[PDB]
Design a binder for this molecule. Structure first.
Ligand SMILES: Cc1ccc(C(=O)Nc2cccc(C(F)(F)F)c2)cc1Nc1nc(-c2cccnc2)nc2c1cnn2C
Length: 261
């Protein structure tokens, strides 16, 4: 929770809205450091809920987790600052780039997301809302796991079946969500389960249906999705094994040439 002096922070265009107010694009100019772009949540009662998020974010330091720049608490407005990700959310970025990235590039995106989740899981942090809309993409296509919560610029179709029903959220339920993210990525941002209703999705999953391989998806990647969607949560791979599986694919790209009929 590094405190930032406001004279370094200049607020520009509004990019969306949050639970506690606006979210804006901005610039950060600190002594001795270059000027960079930042995204800023602004904020009123004495509720410390707004800043409690910053206390959570400050624990995280990883190349695939959104990086908190700092906070302003001795000023108005009160603000949470992170690095600014030029390509925005992954789902809309991929829809804008439909069919325009190679399989190897998509796998590299997924490997980054998996590494970020591996870190969170190692930290005993359960995300609970992992979805492509919660991943930000930088100019080099590095994907960073984020959590926008209640935001704008209830999601059961990313949630493991045991978390929907029993409200049992674990890293293994995040693994389920990660498999959905894999499908979103290999589908260039198609909505999981198309236009099915939330109830239809729950019923389909309970009947053991699983999203099919996206067009051109390597069979080995869809199998990895199916592994993440095992009903028995203890049978799903853990994030370390997921990273290792993707790394094996990057080393052996001939394995990614096998697609289904
Ligand atoms: C400004 C901000 C504030 C919070 C978070 C965030 O991800 N917090 C969070 C909380 C709990 C757990 C985790 C996790 F575990 F996932 F790491 C993260 C990210 C951003 N940064 C941005 N927010 C928005 C944004 C936009 C609209 C509504 N809400 C947020 N747009 C952005 C950025 C950076 N670049 N861009 C384009």
């Amino acid at each position: 929770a590094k405190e930032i002096d406001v004279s370094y922070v200049k607020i520009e265009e509004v990019i969306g809205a949050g639970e506690f107010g606006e979210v804006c694009r901005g610039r950060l100019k600190a002594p001795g450091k270059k000027e960079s772009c930042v995204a800023i949540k602004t904020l009123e009662r004495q509720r410390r809920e707004f800043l409690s998020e910053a206390s959570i974010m400050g624990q995280f330091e990883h190349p695939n987790i959104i990086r908190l720049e700092g906070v302003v608490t001795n000023s108005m407005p009160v603000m949470i600052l992170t690095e600014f990700m030029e390509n925005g959310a992954l789902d809309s970025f991929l829809r804008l780039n439909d069919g325009q990235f190679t399989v190897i590039q998509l796998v590299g995106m997924l490997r980054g997301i998996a590494s970020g989740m591996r870190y969170l899981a190692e930290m005993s942090y359960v995300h609970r809302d992992l979805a492509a809309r919660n991943i930000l993409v930088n100019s080099n296509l590095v994907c960073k796991v984020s959590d926008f919560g209640l935001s704008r610029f209830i999601p059961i179709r990313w949630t493991a079946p045991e978390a929907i029903a029993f409200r049992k959220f674990t890293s293994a339920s995040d693994v389920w969500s990660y498999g959905i993210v894999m499908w979103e990525v290999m589908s260039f941002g198609e909505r999981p389960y198309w236009d099915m209703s939330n109830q239809d999705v729950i019923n389909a999953i309970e009947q053991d249906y699983r999203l099919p391989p996206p067009p051109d998806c390597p069979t080995s990647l869809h199998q990895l999705m199916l592994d993440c969607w095992q009903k028995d949560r203890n049978a799903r791979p853990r994030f370390p094994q997921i990273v290792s599986a993707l790394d094996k694919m990057i080393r052996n790209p001939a394995s990614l040439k096998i697609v289904a009929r």
